[PDB]
Amino acid sequence: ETPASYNLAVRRAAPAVVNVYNRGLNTQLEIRTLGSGVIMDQRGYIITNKHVINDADQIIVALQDGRVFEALLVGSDSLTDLAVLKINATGGLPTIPINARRVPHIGDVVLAIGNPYNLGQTITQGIISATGRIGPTGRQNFLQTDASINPGNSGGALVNSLGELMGINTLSFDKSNETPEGIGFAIPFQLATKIMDKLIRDGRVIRGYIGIGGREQLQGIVVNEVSPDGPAANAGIQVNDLIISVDNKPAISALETMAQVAEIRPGSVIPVVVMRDDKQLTLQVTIQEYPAT
C-alpha cells in the first residue's frame, strides 16, 4: 500500500531546478531580485526569466545538492521574458527531463518547482488550466496553471507527473476584480527550448521584422498598422490590404505567420501577396531585424 505521490517527478526534475539570485552593489552586494532556473543540458546552460536577472551585477545560481556557481548571462529576450545563464561545472550536472514530442493537454497534473520567497525549493501541485494563453505581443503563448505560483517561482520549472518539463513559470495573475487564486502562467517548453537554442547560438534572439501590425472572400491576415520606414511601408504595403501569402507560405494565421517572419534571416527579400480593391498584389519586401526594446 503506497500513498499517491508525485515524488517521482520531484526526484526527476527538482534537482535540475536551481535558485537564481540577482545581486547588486550599493554605495556592498545585496539581493535585489531572486527567482529560479532550470538546467536544460549538461553544458550548464540554464533557462530563466529575463526579469529575474535584469541589471544583475552578479548572478548566483544555487543548486539543491549544495553547489553554488556564478552564472554567466548568455543572453536574454525581453520579448518572451526569457534568459539563459551559463555555469562551468567540473562535476556532473542534473538536467531537466525534456520530451519534445510530448503535447501538454489541459487537465494534465503539473508540479511547479521554484524558490518562493527564498524559503528553498518548493514543490506545488496543480493541473494545466489552459493552453495557448496570451497575456498583447502574443509571443508568450502561456500555459495557464493552478499550481501555487509565487514570487520566486519565475524561471522555475513546471513539470508533469513524469517530471517532464512542460513550461517555465513566468507569471502569476495579479489583476483585481480581490486576489486571483490558482492562476499562473508558464512559457511552453517548446518555446523555452526554441529561445534557449537561439540565445546560446546568437547571444540573443534574432527575429525577422516586416514592420506590420495586423490581425487575422479570401483568407488572409489583415494589416492594421504599418511601421514607418518599415519593410512593409517601403515595399508599398498598406493597412487596409489583406495579406494572402508571406514568403511563399499561406497567411492562414496571424500568429503562425509572425513566427515564420521571426525565422527569416534579416536582409532577405521575400514575396508578400495582398488584396487591394479585390485585386491580388505581389509586393517584394526586405526583412529587417526586430527593433530593440
Determine if 187 is a binding residue for a copy of itself (CB under 8 A).
no
Residue 214 annotated as lining a ligand binding site: yes
User: Among candidates 136, 115, 134, 137, which has minimal Cα distance to 124?
Assistant: 115
Q: Is 61 left (phi over 0), alpha (psi -120 to 50) or beta?
A: beta
Residue 80 annotated as lining a ligand binding site: no
Stretch that binds a copy of itself, among 19-27, 40-48, 104-112, 239-247 (CB under 8 A): 104-112
Shortest distance, position 116 Cβ to a copy of itself, whole Å: 6
| Contacting residue, 95, 129, 234, 245, with a copy of itself by CB under 8 A | 129
Residue 167 annotated as lining a ligand binding site: no
Determine if 148 is a binding residue for a copy of itself (CB under 8 A).
yes
Shortest distance, position 112 Cβ to a copy of itself, whole Å: 9
Determine if 241 is a binding residue for a copy of itself (CB under 8 A).
no
User: Site size for a copy of itself, by CB under 8 A?
Assistant: 61
Which residue in the block uniquely carries the three cell numbers 553554488?
A: 68
Spatial contact of 116 and 152, defined as CB atoms under 8 Å apart: yes
Residue 213 annotated as lining a ligand binding site: yes
Confirm whether 51 is a catalytic residue. yes
Length of the chain: 293
| Residue 86 grid coordinates | 551559463
Residue 210 annotated as lining a ligand binding site: yes
- Alpha-carbon distance of 166 to 188, in angstroms, equals 6
Spatial contact of 64 and 121, defined as CB atoms under 8 Å apart: yes
Stretch that binds a copy of itself, among 6-14, 42-50, 54-62, 239-247 (CB under 8 A): 6-14
Confirm whether 154 is a catalytic residue. yes
Shortest distance, position 286 Cβ to a copy of itself, whole Å: 35
Determine if 189 is a binding residue for a copy of itself (CB under 8 A).
no
| Residue 160 grid coordinates | 508533469
Determine if 88 is a binding residue for a copy of itself (CB under 8 A).
no
Provide the β-strand partners of residue 26.
none
| Contacting residue, 22, 48, 121, 257, with a copy of itself by CB under 8 A | 121
Stretch that binds a copy of itself, among 23-31, 72-80, 115-123, 281-289 (CB under 8 A): 115-123
| Contacting residue, 10, 18, 39, 47, with a copy of itself by CB under 8 A | 10
* Lateral strand order in the sheet of 156-160: 122-133, 142-145, 184-188, 165-172, 156-160
Spatial contact of 71 and 140, defined as CB atoms under 8 Å apart: no
- Alpha-carbon distance of 287 to 227, in angstroms, equals 13
Determine if 23 is a binding residue for a copy of itself (CB under 8 A).
no
Determine if 92 is a binding residue for a copy of itself (CB under 8 A).
no
Q: Per the residue annotation, which of 51, 76, 108, 148 is the catalytic one?
A: 51
In the chain the first and final C-alpha atoms are separated, in Å, by 56
- What's the DSSP call for residue 290? P
- Alpha-carbon distance of 157 to 146, in angstroms, equals 14
Distances (CA, A) of 93 to 15, 194, 251: 9, 21, 43
Binding-site annotation, residues: 137, 210-215, 290
Contacting residues toward a copy of itself, per CB under 8 A: 1-10, 12, 14, 97, 99, 101-102, 105-109, 111, 116-117, 119-130, 133-134, 144, 146-151, 160-164, 172-175, 177-183
Catalytic residue IDs: 51, 81, 154
- Going by the annotation, the residues of the binding site for substrate are 137, 210-215, 290
